[PDB]
Amino acid sequence: NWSVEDIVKGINSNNLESQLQATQAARKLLSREKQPPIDNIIRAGLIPKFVSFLGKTDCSPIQFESAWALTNIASGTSEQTKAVVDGGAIPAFISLLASPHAHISEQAVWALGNIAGDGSAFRDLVIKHGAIDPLLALLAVPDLSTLACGYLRNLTWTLSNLCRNKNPAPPLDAVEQILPTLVRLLHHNDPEVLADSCWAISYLTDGPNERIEMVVKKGVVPQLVKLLGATELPIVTPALRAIGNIVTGTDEQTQKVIDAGALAVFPSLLTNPKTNIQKEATWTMSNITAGRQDQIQQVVNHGLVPFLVGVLSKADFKTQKEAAWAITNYTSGGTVEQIVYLVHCGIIEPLMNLLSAKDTKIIQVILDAISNIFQAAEKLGETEKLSIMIEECGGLDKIEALQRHENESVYKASLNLIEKYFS
């Protein structure tokens, strides 16, 4: 239809009708489902003319067309988004957010989300130019269901990208300004709004314990636990990610998670047909079992030890490695009674059966778990029994075969274990 030269000539004219004609042509050219000529429009020096058109309040059509074109230019490579940013598009879009026309302000939300989604640098740029205030003003209405069809989803996504990325992490004041709205949205009844809100809280929980403490003090943990049980995987995945990132912090934050009732959902999460759900749940549990002894006892009371043993037995090697870590932390900081309950639930057989793995990490982890269980047995004066069990499970053969392992740590472990219990 239109060539880059024709679009340049139309946009370089002074006739607003022709300028809008060429801007619409550029939108369609860059909206092509295949090979959009983004680099050719960039090389033609058109981004600045687009950022200028964004300010033509007199012609809202060309405002919309230029916003669309710039958004689809910033939707590609990081260098094309850099081009859009250098043209001064961030302040123009932030000002357009307040446009009386809802579609133009929605396109502006979209553009700012694409820009801030490139990385932490452009995110902090969008934040510095003052985007959070108007974006959240668009949601000030007490009832979120009064907002137009689709506006809330776009604004939630853009706010998620404004909480995304690390090195540097989002400015603290920005997170504290956005978190209450994220709570309100976490209590919304739209599946996609919930999904993006959980992803945003996940980004915010992935970091130091201070950020986790911010998120927890806002009081999202109960609603996150509620969403853990949602029927929508797009909602459970981010919710489980956030819950797992929270328990990686202090034992008080882990206890907040436990008190919210999260451990009651893990019997299903650890048996979810999706393997990623199983792996994330097992990793979260491994972080939980690495806590205080009372937290291990709460894991026991919720009946999760059977499920952790079951995932150590029947899951894939990824979830099985997470489960090995979980059981090793269970035995490392647990009580002799809890370790005895673990052995009663049948951990010896899976721990043995996983000693024939190529990953040296899981080998060392399981060896340490065995040493801890043996220390517990020694406290209980029943190490001969446990050695007989490992024998019956063919363990002794496994630990002896590990004597010929290249890694000095696995060899030395197996050697100490054999010399101390199997000699």
Binding site: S75, G244, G291, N329
Partner: peptide, 12 residues
């Protein structure tokens, strides 16, 4: 204690 589908980074 150790640490470790996502929404799109850019759209349309």
């Amino acid at each position: 204690k150790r640490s470790a589908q996502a929404t799109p980074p850019k759209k349309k």
